[PDB]
PDB file of C-alpha atoms in Angstrom:
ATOM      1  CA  UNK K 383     -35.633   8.474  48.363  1.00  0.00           C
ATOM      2  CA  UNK K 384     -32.253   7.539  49.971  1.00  0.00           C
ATOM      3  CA  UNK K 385     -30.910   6.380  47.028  1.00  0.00           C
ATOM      4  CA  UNK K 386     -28.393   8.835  45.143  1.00  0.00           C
ATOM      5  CA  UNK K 387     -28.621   9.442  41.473  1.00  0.00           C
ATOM      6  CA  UNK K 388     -26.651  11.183  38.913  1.00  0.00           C
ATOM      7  CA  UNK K 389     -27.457  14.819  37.893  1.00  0.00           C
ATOM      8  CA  UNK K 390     -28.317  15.192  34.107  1.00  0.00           C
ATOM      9  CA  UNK K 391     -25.092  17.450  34.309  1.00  0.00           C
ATOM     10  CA  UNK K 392     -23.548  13.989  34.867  1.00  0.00           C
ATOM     11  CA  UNK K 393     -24.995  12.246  31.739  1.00  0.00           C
ATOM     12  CA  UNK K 394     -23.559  14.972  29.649  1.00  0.00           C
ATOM     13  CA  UNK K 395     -20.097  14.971  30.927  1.00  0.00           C
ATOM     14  CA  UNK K 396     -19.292  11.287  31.169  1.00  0.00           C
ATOM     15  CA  UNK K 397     -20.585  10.923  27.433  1.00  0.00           C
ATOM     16  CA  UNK K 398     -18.773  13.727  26.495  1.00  0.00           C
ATOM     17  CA  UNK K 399     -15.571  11.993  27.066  1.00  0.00           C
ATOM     18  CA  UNK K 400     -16.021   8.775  26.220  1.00  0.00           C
ATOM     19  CA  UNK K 401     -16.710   9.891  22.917  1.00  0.00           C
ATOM     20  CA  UNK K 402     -13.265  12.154  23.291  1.00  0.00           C
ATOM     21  CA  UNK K 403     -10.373   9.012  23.375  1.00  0.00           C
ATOM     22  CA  UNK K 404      -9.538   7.773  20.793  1.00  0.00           C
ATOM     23  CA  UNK K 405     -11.008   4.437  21.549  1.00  0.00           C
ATOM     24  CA  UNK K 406     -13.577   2.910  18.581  1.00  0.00           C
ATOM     25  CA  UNK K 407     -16.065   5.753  17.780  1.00  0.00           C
ATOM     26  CA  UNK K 408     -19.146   6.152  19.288  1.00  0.00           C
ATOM     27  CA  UNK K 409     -21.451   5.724  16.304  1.00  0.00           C
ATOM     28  CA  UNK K 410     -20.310   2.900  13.658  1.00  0.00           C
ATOM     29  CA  UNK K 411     -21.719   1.554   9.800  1.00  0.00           C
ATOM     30  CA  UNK K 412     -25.539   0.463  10.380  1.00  0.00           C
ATOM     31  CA  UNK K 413     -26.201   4.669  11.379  1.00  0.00           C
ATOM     32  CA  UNK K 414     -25.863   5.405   7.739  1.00  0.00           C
ATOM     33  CA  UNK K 415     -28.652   2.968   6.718  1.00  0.00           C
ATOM     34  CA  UNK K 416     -30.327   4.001   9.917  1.00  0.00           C
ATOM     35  CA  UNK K 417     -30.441   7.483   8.709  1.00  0.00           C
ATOM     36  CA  UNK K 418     -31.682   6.176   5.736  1.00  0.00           C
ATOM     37  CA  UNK K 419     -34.600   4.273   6.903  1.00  0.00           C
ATOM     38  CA  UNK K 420     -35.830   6.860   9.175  1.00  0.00           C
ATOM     39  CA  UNK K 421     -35.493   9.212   6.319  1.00  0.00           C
ATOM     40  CA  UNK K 422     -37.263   7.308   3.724  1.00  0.00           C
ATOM     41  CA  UNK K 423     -40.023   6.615   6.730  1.00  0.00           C
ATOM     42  CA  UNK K 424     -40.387  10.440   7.523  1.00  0.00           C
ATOM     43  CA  UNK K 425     -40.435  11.717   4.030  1.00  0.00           C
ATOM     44  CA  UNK K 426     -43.343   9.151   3.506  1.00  0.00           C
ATOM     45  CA  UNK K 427     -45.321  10.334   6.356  1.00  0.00           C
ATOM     46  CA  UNK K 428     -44.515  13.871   5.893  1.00  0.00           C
ATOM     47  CA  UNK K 429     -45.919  14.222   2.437  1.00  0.00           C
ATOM     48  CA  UNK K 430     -49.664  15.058   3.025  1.00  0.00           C
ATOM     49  CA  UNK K 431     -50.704  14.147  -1.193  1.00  0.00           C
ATOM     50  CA  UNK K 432     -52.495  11.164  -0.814  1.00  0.00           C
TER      51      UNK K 432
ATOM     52  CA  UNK Z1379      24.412  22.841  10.998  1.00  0.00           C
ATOM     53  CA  UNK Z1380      22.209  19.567  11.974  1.00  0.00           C
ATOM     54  CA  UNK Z1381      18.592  20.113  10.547  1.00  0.00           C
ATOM     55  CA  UNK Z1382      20.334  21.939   7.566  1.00  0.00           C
ATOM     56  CA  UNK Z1383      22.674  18.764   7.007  1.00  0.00           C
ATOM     57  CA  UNK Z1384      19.353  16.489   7.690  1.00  0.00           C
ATOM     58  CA  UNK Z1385      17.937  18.060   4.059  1.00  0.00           C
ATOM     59  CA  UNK Z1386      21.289  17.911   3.150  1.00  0.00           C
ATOM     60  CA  UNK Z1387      21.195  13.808   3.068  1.00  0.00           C
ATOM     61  CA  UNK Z1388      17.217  13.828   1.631  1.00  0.00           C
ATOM     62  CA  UNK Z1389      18.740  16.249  -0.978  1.00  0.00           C
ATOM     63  CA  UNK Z1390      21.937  14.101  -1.658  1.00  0.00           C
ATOM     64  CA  UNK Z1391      19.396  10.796  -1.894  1.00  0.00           C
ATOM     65  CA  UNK Z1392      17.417  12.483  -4.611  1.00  0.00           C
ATOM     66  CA  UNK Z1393      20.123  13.627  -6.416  1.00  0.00           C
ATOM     67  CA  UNK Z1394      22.030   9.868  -6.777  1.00  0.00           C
ATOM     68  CA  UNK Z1395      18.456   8.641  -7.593  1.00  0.00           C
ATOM     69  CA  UNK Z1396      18.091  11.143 -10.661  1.00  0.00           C
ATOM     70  CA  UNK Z1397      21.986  10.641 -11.581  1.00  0.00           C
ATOM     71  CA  UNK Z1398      21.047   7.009 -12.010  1.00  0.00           C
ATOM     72  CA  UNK Z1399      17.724   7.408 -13.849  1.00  0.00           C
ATOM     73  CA  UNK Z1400      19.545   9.391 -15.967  1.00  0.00           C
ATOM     74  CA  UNK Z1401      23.758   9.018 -16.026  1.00  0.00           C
ATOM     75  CA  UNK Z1402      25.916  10.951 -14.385  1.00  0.00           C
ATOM     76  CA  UNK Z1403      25.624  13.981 -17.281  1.00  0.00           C
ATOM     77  CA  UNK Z1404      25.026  17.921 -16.441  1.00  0.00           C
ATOM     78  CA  UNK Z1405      22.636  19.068 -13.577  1.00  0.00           C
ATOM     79  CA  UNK Z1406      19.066  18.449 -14.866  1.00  0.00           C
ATOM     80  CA  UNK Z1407      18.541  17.096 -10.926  1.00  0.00           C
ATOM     81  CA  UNK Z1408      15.349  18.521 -11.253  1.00  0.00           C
ATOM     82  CA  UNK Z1409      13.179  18.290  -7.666  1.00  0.00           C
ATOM     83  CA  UNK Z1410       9.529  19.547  -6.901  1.00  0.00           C
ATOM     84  CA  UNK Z1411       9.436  21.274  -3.671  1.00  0.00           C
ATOM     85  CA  UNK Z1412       6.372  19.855  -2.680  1.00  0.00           C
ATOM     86  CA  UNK Z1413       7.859  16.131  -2.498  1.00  0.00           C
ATOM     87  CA  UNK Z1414      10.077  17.617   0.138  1.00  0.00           C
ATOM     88  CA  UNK Z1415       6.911  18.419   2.031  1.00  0.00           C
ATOM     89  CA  UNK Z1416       6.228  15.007   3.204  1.00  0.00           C
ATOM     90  CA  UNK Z1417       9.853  13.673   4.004  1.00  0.00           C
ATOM     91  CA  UNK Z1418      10.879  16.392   6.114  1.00  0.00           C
ATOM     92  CA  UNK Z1419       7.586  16.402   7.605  1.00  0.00           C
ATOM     93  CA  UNK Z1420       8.436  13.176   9.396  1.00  0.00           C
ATOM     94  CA  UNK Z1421      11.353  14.667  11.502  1.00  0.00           C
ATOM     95  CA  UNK Z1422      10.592  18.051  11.905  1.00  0.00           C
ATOM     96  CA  UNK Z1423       7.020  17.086  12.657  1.00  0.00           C
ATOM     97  CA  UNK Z1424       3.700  18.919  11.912  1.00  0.00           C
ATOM     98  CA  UNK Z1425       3.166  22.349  13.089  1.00  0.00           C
ATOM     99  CA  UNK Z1426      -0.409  21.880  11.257  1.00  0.00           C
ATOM    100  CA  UNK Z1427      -0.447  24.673   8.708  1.00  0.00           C
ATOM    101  CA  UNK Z1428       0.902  24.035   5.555  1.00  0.00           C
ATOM    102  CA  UNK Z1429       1.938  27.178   4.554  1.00  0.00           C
ATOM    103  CA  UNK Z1430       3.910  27.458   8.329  1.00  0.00           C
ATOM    104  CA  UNK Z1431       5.879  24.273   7.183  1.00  0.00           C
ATOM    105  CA  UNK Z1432       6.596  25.521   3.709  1.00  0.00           C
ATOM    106  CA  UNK Z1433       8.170  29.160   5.403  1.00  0.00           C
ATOM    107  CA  UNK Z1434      10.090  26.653   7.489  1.00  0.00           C
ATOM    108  CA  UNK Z1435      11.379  24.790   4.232  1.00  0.00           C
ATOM    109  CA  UNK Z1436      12.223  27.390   2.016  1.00  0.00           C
ATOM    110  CA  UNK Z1437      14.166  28.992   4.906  1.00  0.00           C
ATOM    111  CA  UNK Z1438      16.206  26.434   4.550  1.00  0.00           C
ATOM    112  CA  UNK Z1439      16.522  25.812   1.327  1.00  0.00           C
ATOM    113  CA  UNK Z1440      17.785  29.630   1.449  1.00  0.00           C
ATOM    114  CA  UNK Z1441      20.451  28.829   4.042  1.00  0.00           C
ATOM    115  CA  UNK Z1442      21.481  25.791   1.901  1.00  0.00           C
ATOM    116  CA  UNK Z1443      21.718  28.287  -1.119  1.00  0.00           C
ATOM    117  CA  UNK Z1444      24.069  30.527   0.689  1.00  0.00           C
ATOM    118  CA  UNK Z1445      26.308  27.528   1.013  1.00  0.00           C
ATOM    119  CA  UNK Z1446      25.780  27.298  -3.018  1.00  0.00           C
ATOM    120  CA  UNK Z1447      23.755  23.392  -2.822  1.00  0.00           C
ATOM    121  CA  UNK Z1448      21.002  24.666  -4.586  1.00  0.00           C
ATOM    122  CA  UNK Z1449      19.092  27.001  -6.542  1.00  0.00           C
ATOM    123  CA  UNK Z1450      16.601  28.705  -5.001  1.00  0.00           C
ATOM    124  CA  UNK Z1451      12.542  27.857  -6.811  1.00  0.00           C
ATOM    125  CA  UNK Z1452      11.994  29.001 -10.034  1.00  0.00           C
ATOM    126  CA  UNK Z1453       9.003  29.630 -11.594  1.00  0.00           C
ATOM    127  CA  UNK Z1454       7.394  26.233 -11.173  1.00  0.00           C
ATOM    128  CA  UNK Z1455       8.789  25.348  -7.407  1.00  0.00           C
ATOM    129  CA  UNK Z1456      11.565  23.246  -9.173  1.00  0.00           C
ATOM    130  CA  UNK Z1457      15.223  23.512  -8.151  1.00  0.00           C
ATOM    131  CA  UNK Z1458      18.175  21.987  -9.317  1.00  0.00           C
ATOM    132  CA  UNK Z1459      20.854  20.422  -6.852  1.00  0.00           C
ATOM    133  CA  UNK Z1460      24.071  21.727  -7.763  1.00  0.00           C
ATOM    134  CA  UNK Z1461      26.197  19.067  -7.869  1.00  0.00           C
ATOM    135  CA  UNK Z1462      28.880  20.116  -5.176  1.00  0.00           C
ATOM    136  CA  UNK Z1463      26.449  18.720  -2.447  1.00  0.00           C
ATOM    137  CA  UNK Z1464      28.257  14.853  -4.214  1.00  0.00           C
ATOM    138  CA  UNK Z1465      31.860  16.017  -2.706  1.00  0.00           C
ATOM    139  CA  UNK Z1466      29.503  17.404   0.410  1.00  0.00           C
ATOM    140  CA  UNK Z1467      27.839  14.370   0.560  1.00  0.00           C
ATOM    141  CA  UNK Z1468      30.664  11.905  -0.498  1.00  0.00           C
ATOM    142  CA  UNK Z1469      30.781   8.393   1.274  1.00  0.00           C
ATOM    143  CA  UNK Z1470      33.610   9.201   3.658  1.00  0.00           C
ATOM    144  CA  UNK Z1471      31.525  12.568   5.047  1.00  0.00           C
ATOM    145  CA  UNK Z1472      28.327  10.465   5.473  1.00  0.00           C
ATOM    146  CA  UNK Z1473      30.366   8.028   7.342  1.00  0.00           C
ATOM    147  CA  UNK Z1474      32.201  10.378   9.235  1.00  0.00           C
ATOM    148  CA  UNK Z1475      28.783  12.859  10.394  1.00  0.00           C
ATOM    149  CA  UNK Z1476      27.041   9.620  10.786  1.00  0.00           C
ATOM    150  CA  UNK Z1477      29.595   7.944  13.599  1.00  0.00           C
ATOM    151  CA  UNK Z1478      29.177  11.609  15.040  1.00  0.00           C
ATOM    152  CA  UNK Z1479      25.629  11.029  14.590  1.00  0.00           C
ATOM    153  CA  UNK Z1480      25.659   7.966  16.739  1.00  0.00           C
ATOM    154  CA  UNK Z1481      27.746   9.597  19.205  1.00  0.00           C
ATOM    155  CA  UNK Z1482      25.250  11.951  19.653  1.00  0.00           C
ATOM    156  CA  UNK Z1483      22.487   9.268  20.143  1.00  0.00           C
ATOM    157  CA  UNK Z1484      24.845   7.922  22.701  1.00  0.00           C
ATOM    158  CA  UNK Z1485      25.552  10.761  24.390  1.00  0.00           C
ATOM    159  CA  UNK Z1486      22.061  11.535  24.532  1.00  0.00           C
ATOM    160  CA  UNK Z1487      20.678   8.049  25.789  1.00  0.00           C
TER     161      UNK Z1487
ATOM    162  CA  UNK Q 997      -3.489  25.943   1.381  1.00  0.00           C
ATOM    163  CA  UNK Q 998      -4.470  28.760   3.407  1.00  0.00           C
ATOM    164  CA  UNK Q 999      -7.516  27.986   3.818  1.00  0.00           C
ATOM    165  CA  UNK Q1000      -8.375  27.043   7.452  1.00  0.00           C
ATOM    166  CA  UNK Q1001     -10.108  24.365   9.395  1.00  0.00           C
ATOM    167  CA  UNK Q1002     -11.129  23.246  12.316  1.00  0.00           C
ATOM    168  CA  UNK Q1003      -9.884  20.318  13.939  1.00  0.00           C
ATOM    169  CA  UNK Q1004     -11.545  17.434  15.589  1.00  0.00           C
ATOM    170  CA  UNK Q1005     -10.586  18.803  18.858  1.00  0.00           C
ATOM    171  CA  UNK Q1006     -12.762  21.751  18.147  1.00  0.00           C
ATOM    172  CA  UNK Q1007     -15.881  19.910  16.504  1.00  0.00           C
ATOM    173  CA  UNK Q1008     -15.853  17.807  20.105  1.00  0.00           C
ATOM    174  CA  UNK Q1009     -15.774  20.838  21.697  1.00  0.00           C
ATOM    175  CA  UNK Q1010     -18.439  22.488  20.282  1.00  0.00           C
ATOM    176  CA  UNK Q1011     -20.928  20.075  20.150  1.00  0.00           C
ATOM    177  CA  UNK Q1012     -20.241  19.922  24.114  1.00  0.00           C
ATOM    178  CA  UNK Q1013     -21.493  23.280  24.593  1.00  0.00           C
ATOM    179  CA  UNK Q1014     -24.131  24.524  22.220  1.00  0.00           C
ATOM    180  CA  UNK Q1015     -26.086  21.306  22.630  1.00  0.00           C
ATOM    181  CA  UNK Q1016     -25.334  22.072  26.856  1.00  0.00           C
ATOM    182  CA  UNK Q1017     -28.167  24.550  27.337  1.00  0.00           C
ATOM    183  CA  UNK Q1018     -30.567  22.967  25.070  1.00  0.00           C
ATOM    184  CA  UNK Q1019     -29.231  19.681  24.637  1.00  0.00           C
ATOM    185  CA  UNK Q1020     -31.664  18.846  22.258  1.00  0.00           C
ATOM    186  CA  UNK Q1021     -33.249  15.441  23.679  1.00  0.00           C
ATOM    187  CA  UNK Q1022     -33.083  12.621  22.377  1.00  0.00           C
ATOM    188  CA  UNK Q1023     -36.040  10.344  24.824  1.00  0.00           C
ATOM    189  CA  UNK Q1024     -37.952  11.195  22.488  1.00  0.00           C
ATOM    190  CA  UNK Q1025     -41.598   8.856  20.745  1.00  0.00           C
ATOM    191  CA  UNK Q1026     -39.748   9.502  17.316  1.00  0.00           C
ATOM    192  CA  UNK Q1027     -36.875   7.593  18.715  1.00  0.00           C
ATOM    193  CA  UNK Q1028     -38.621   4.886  20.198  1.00  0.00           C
ATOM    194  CA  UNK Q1029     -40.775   3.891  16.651  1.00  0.00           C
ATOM    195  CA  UNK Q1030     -36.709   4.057  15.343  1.00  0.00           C
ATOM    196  CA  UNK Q1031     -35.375   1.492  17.488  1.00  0.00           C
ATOM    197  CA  UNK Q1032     -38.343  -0.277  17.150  1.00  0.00           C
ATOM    198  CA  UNK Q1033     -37.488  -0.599  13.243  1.00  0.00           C
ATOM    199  CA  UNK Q1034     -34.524  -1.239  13.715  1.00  0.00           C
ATOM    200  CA  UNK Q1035     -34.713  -4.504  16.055  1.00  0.00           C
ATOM    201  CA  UNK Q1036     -37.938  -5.181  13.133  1.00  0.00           C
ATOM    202  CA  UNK Q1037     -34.365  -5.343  10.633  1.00  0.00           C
ATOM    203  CA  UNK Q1038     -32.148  -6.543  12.619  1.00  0.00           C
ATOM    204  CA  UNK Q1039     -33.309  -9.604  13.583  1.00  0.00           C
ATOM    205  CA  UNK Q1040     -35.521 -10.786  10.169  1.00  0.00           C
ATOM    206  CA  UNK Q1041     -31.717 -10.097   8.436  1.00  0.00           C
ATOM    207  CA  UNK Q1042     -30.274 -12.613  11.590  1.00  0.00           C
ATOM    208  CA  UNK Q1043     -33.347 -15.043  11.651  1.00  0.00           C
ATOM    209  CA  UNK Q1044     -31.488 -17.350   8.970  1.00  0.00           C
ATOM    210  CA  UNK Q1045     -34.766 -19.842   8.917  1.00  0.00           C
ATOM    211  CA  UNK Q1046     -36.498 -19.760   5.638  1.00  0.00           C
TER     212      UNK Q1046
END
């Protein structure tokens, strides 16, 4: 369309290294509880017993 | 040589630390090899395999033997400093190997 | 002690190639109804108003 865009190759190197410095990480605290939400949520849903 | 005298001065530190603790008696200078682990680790660095480092220490404890410092590890990893490393170690060497020391640095810089 | 591990170096490097041919994707509905709890959290634990 004229316009350039960036292969998915792209997407995977660039957040390959950001993630690599040793700047702050990438994921941080709330993923923990995140996990745990989404766990607690699919578990729930999973379990066919009524 | 350098690196051995480097232990040399850790060794000589633990030694007048123990002598205090407990008088200037016989040799019970008792030392756990595994304390050395850490200090050295800060100058010689951190090849990143324990066991590596630990060849690289007992090596020279060895050498250090040879000049008759210390016993080499018993049973339990322990040796005793023999006390000639004091007359090795005395204030006027440490002053003498340290303006050396310096000399070096300067040389160096 | 002998026993061996791997460095962080090598975790980074792994995850940048066996998720390289399937990348497992992430644009996925599943993650959508995620974020969507998670704003849900985040902003009835920052709506200080009674």
């Amino acid at each position: 369309d004229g316009r350039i865009f960036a292969t998915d190759a792209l997407e995977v190197a660039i957040t390959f290294v950001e993630s690599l410095d040793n700047r702050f990480m990438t994921s941080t605290a709330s993923r923990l509880s995140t996990v745990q939400r989404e766990i607690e949520n699919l578990e729930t849903r999973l379990n066919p017993n009524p | 040589n350098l690196e051995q005298s480097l232990l040399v001065a850790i060794l000589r530190q633990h030694f007048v630390a123990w002598e205090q603790e407990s008088g200037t008696g016989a040799s019970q200078a008792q030392i756990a090899i595994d304390d050395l682990l850490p200090q050295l680790q800060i100058y010689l660095g951190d090849p990143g395999s324990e066991s590596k480092e630990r060849t690289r220490l007992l090596t020279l404890l060895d050498q250090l033997k040879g000049h008759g410092l210390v016993t080499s590890p018993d049973a339990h990893e322990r040796i005793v400093i023999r006390p000639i490393i004091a007359h090795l170690a005395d204030p006027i060497n440490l002053q003498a190997l340290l303006a050396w020391l310096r000399e070096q640095i300067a040389q160096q810089t």
